[PDB]
Amino acid sequence: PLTQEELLREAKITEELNLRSLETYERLEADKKKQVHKKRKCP
Amino acid sequence: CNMRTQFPDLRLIQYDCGKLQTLAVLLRQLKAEGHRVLIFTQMTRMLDVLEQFLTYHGHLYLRLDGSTRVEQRQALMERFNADKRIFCFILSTRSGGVGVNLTGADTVVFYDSDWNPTMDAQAQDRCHRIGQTRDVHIYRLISERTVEENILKKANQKRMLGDMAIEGGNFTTAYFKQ
Amino acid sequence: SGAVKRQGRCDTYATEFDLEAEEYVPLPKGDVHKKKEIIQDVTLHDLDVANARPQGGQDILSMMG
Amino acid sequence: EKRKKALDLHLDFIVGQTEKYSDLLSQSLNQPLTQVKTPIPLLLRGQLREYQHIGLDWLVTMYEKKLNGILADEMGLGKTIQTISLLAHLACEKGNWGPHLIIVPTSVMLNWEMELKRWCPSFKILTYYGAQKERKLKRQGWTKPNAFHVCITS
Amino acid sequence: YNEGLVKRLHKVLRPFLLRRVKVDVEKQMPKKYEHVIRCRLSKRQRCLYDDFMAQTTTFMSVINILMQLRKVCNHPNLFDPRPVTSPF
């Protein structure tokens, strides 16, 4: 029973939330990949 | 030790299979010219025998046999694409899914052919996909006067059927507009 | 027989160095412990020699003899 | 003898109906303003290639003509992107926010969720992975209108 | 070859199927070539192949024989490795 404008506003809010989630997932994956490639020794 | 126990010579692994002899010649040529090879086989025990043959000949290899854990598959892909020493990457045609991006190699060797040419096409596309900057050569090894010739004939018949059915028509919007 | 044979450094370590002076061998693909039944062709003379000039103990006395 | 004639007439009838459908699709696609009828979705928030835009137009034409179809684009051409663009177009212009079901292989499920979040963050994405208790918990209250827009499942 | 039937099938499938090959779409694409190399069997492989083809005529069906022949063509070590010989 909702109208199009309400759907658009809810879409805006959910878009903000999903962008936050996507950014967090990208950061976690990039950090994990960067940490995997590390390899060092000791003097 | 030599008088106490005798092991079969590692050389006899290649002597007992003509595919292995032809593959040894082909792999030596490919390494001389400076390429990287993907070897696809339908059997994991064949993967083990290929491990023995490659280690005997000195070709460093990585393995994805369809039983490896998923988190290990991406690591193997990244290592193979990053490391230039790894000559070969033995794989099972039915495994790997579609998310594997093996653009590092430039040569594909099918140790044995699948009944379904789509699976071989996916194995080829594993290396021929977009973003790959070298010519791709596909080598198919077939045993003379054996069932493998029947397998290749069946695969070619299926490819011809696909070309008749789907590739025959343009199936694009250009036909509707024209 | 207590016969130990070293076949090689595992293939997984074949990339660590460029010149190691090692022969690499793939990982065994069966079980760790195997039992195989085989047929041995021997003669009575072979048994006599094995029990007259023993070399199965792997001790110092066998080498000395 | 009569069997061949019956099969021929049945196949002729099927071919005639299919030709009518194809003619309707051709007439729908030929509407003038290269001359792509459907604009990009305002919610799409991404750059499509030309052939992806053509595929979006074809999908919208199939939706309007009420025909189901197979998108057999070769690997890497962006079939998932085309599907997401179709859903965004329908939701924005048509109002088809309605619950859509996307059945994908389990390995590709996370990638599809990633693509939906990348292109269309507006859609309320529900993912159906987990054990029985987790699936039942994530179901609870999903019959409510405007509770989830697209569901991904294996 | 009856091209009319093929055209009728194309007409039937036309309104529903959309196909695009990378050749016509992604132009900046490297070429591909396919080579077929014939290989001969070893003495061990030939003996095992003949033994299986003899087992065709007698409990093993054509499918089991087919799989065994595929394994033989792959490598005879899939059946039994060459023994490690040691004293009794």
Ligand SMILES: Nc1ncnc2c1ncn2[C@@H]1O[C@H](COP(=O)(O)OP(=O)(O)OP(O)(O)=S)[C@@H](O)[C@H]1O
């Ligand atoms: N317009 C675009 N802009 C940026 N990336 C794009 C675009 N179109 C496609 N891609 C990328 O293309 C890749 C493949 O997308 P998909 O739609 O999954 O292709 P595909 O047809 O599904 O391949 P398969 O068959 O699933 S392996 C993804 O990494 C997308 O990010």
Ligand SMILES: [Mg+2]
């Ligand atoms: Mg896909």
